[PDB]
Amino acid sequence: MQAIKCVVVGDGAVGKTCLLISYTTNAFPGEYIPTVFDNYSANVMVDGKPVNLGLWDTAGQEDYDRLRPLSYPQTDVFLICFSLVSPASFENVRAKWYPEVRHHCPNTPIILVGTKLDLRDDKDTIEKLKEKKLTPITYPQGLAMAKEIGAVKYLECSALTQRGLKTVFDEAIRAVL
């Protein structure tokens, strides 16, 4: 049965750990957001074909440019993530994440994931951004970034509501099959 290593990369603002927890437990953790998600694997069926999906977090390695690539070899698919309500994380897809992932893994598929979809329409989040002369990241912006990096898909999700969340990981697997 096919084994799949999927690594999750991107800025601290994406909520990488919360994403993975919410996905694997089928619930936003709410009460307390754990800082630790340990390497995970489970059987999921996608388009019939059953598969063993492996998930690695990288939270905590955001400042260690030489330690991060220790996780990259033999990855089957990357999720490169940014938060929809952090333009700085979005720009880092291009400045930081894509270059290193490509440098180490030139032929590995990338899914581009915008997280915190639940905040893109949130008045307080919007106003906090307007006070810095910024706005949330919209759909065509993600599509244009996906195209620029060679991403096979651009997908938007919320760990909070689960909207789009299961699809992210379905599509990660489809990108390998």
Binding site: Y32, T35, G60, Y64, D65, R66, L67, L70
Partner: protein
């Protein structure tokens, strides 16, 4: 309440880290050192390259660090001191990180499916590679737990700051040690 959830996670994840290294040592490593199975010439007598100093990391955690963290369970605001006390031991993650690329290529280029065979045989969810990244994960995670404690512990909290300092310095020094 928040400081208690973080401390609990600290301890629970320390226990899992100890269990994880212990499993790695007694399956993947024990098959190489045992004398029970067919060892590829490509890796023979190179368990030192593959596993680096992971024995010694495990012994630190299993003999010392976990017992001490446990003593700070009801003292979350003081736990930074644990990292100060034991700062010298964390220097071994610098050695471990340095070696890790040599480890990975060695397993790639020369081990074929020796370790996959072992994994299937023991019924392990985690591959040898999954286990061997763990020290790199753990050593960069302590600083996140200390930052969380800083967001919810009072000015009785240079007993977090100095701990965090140490736990920022170790991974940076490991990072700066890579070629």
């Amino acid at each position: 309440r928040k400081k208690e959830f973080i401390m609990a996670e600290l301890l629970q994840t320390e226990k899992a880290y100890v269990r994880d290294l212990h499993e790695c040592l007694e399956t993947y490593l024990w098959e190489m050192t045992s004398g029970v199975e067919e060892i590829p010439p490509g890796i023979l007598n190179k368990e030192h390259i593959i596993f680096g100093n992971i024995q010694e990391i495990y012994d630190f955690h299993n003999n010392i660090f976990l017992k001490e963290l446990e003593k700070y369970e009801q003292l979350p605001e003081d736990v930074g001191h644990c990292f100060v006390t034991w700062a010298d031991k964390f220097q071994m993650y610098v050695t471990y990180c340095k070696n890790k690329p040599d480890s990975n290529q060695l397993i790639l280029e020369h081990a074929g499916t020796f370790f996959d065979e072992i994994q299937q045989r023991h019924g392990l969810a985690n591959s040898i590679s999954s286990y061997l990244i763990k020290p790199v994960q753990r050593v960069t995670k302590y600083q996140l737990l200390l930052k969380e404690l800083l967001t919810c512990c009072e000015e009785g909290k240079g007993e977090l700051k100095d701990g965090l300092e140490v736990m920022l310095s170790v991974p940076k020094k490991a990072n700066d040690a890579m070629h």
